[PDB]
Amino acid sequence: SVGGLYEIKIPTNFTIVGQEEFIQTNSPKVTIDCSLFVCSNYAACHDL
Amino acid sequence: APNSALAKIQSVVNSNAQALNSLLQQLFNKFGAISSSLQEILSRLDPPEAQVQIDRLINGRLTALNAYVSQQLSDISLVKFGAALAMEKVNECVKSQSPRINFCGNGNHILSLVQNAPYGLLFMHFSYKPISFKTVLVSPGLCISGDVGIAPKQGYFIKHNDHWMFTGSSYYYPEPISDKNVVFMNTCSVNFTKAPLVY
Amino acid sequence: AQVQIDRLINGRLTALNAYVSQQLSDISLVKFGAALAMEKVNECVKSQ
Amino acid sequence: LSEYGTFCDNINSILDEVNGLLDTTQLHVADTLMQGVTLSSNLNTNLH
Amino acid sequence: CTGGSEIRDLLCVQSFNGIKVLPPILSESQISGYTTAATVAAMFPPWSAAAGIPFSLNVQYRINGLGVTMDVLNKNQKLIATAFNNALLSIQNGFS
Numbered sequence: 001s002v003g004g005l006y007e008i009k010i011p012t013n014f015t016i017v018g019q020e021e022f023i024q025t026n027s028p029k030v031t032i033d034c035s036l037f038v039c040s041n042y043a044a045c046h047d048l
Numbered sequence: 049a050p051n052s053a054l055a056k057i058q059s060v061v062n063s064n065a066q067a068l069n070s071l072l073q074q075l076f077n078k079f080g081a082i083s084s085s086l087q088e089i090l091s092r093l094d095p096p097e098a099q100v101q102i103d104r105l106i107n108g109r110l111t112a113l114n115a116y117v118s119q120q121l122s123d124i125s126l127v128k129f130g131a132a133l134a135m136e137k138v139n140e141c142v143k144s145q146s147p148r149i150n151f152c153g154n155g156n157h158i159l160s161l162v163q164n165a166p167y168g169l170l171f172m173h174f175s176y177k178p179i180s181f182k183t184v185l186v187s188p189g190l191c192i193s194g195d196v197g198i199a200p201k202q203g204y205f206i207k208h209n210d211h212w213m214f215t216g217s218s219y220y221y222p223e224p225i226s227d228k229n230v231v232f233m234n235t236c237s238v239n240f241t242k243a244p245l246v247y
Numbered sequence: 248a249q250v251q252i253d254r255l256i257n258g259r260l261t262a263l264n265a266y267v268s269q270q271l272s273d274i275s276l277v278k279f280g281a282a283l284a285m286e287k288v289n290e291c292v293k294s295q
Numbered sequence: 296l297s298e299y300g301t302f303c304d305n306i307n308s309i310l311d312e313v314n315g316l317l318d319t320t321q322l323h324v325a326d327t328l329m330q331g332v333t334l335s336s337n338l339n340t341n342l343h
Numbered sequence: 344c345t346g347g348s349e350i351r352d353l354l355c356v357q358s359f360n361g362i363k364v365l366p367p368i369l370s371e372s373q374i375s376g377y378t379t380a381a382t383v384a385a386m387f388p389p390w391s392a393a394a395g396i397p398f399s400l401n402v403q404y405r406i407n408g409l410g411v412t413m414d415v416l417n418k419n420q421k422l423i424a425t426a427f428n429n430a431l432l433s434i435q436n437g438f439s
C-alpha cells in the first residue's frame with residue numbers, strides 16, 4: 001500500500017455470459033419380471 | 049457442438065442402456081452349467097440331473113438380479129441427491145436469488161432460468177462478466193472530519209480529480225461519497241487513509 | 248479339479264461383488280462429503 | 296472363469312466408473328478452490 | 344515391491360494378487376498448491392477470496408456483523424490479530 005492505497009483492477013466494461021447446467025432429477029423406471037427373467041416359460045424351473 | 053450438458057443427458061441414457069444390456073447378457077451366461085438355455089437343458093438331460101443344472105442357472109440369475117438391484121438402489125440414491133439439488137437451484141436461483149456465492153454456477157451470478165430436459169432440468173445461469181479492466185489506486189476506508197471512520201459499501205474509495213470519491217467494486221464509475229455508499233464507524237481504524245477535509 | 252475350482256470361483260466372485268457393492272456405497276458418501284466441502288469452500292472460505 | 300461369463304467385465308466396469316467419479320470429484324474440488332482466484336505476480340513465499 | 348527387503352509389505356502381497364490403489368489424477372502436492380493459492384488470495388490485493396478487502400478488515404466486519412460495536416474492534420485490532428493467530432497455533436498444536 002503506497003500511502004494508504006492499494007492497486008486493484010476494476011472492470012471498465014462488461015457483458016452477460018450464459019452457462020448451462022444439466023441436473024438429473026429422474027431415471028428410466030426399470031421393471032423386471034423376476035420370474036420370467038429367471039425361469040422364462042418353464043415349469044421345471046419355477047418349481048425349483 | 050460437443051457440449052458438457054448434452055453429453056451428461058446422453059450419458060444418463062447410455063448408462064441405463066448399458067446396464068439393461070448387461071442384465072440381458074446375464075441370461076446367456078452358463079454359470080458353470082452345461083448350457084445357458086433351459087430348453088437345451090431339458091431337451092438333452094433327464095429330471096434328477098436337469099434339476100442340478102437348473103439350480104446353477106437359478107443361482108447365477110438371482111445373483112445377477114441382486115447385483116443389478118444393488119446398483120439400481122445406488123443410482124437412485126444419486127438421482128435423489130440430484131433432484132434435491134435441482135429443487136434447491138429452482139428455489140434459490142430461479143424463483144429467487146439466495147446470497148450464496150457459487151451455488152448458481154461460477155462467477156458473479158446475476159440470475160438463472162430453467163428449462164425441461166430429458167430425465168432432469170437444464171439451468172441457464174447468467175453471470176456478470178468483466179470485459180476490460182483499469183488498474184486504479186483504491187483505499188478500503190477513510191478517516192474523515194472528527195476522526196470518524198467510513199468504509200465503502202460494495203466498492204472502494206478512489207482519488208479522482210484530486211478528490212476522494214467512491215466507485216462500485218464491479219464497474220469503474222467515480223461518483224460522490226454519500227451515506228448511500230458508506231458504512232459509518234465512530235472511530236476510524238488505524239491505516240485508514242487520513243482525509244480530514246472530506247464531508 | 249473343475250468342481251473344486253468352481254467352488255473357489257463362486258466364493259471369490261461373491262467376495263468381489265460384495266466388495267464392489269460396499270465400494271459404490273462408500274463412494275456415494277464421498278460424493279456427498281465432496282459436495283459439502285465445495286459448499287463450505289464457497290460459503291465459508293471465499294465468502295460468508 | 297471365462298465359461299462363467301462377463302462377471303469380471305462387470306466388476307472392472309463398476310470400479311472404473313467409481314474411479315471416474317473420484318477423478319471427476321477431485322477436479323470439481325480443485326476447480327472450486329481455484330474459482331475466482333487472482334494473485335499478484337509480485338507475490339513471493341520467501342518474503343511475504 | 345521389487346526391492347530385496349526381507350519385510351514383505353502387505354500392500355505388495357495385495358498388488359501381486361491384482362488389488363492395487365492407483366494415484367489420484369491430481370497429486371496431493373497440486374491440491375496443496377491450490378489451497379495455498381486460495382489462502383494467499385485473502386491476504387494481498389486484489390483479495391479475490393476475501394470479499395475484495397484486506398483480511399483484517401474482513402475479520403473486523405464479520406465480528407461486527409455478530410453484534411459487536413466497531414469501536415472496541417478497531418481499538419483492539421492487535422488483540423484480535425493475536426487471538427486469531429493463537430487460534431491458528433491451537434489448531435496446529437492439536438494434531439500432536
Ligand SMILES: *[C@@H]1O[C@H](CO)[C@@H](O)[C@H](O)[C@H]1NC(C)=O
Nearest residue numbers: 011012013014015178179180
Ligand atoms: C464494451 O464492449 C462492447 C463489446 O466489445 C463494445 O461494443 C462497447 O463499445 C464497449 N463499451 C465501452 C464503454 O468500452
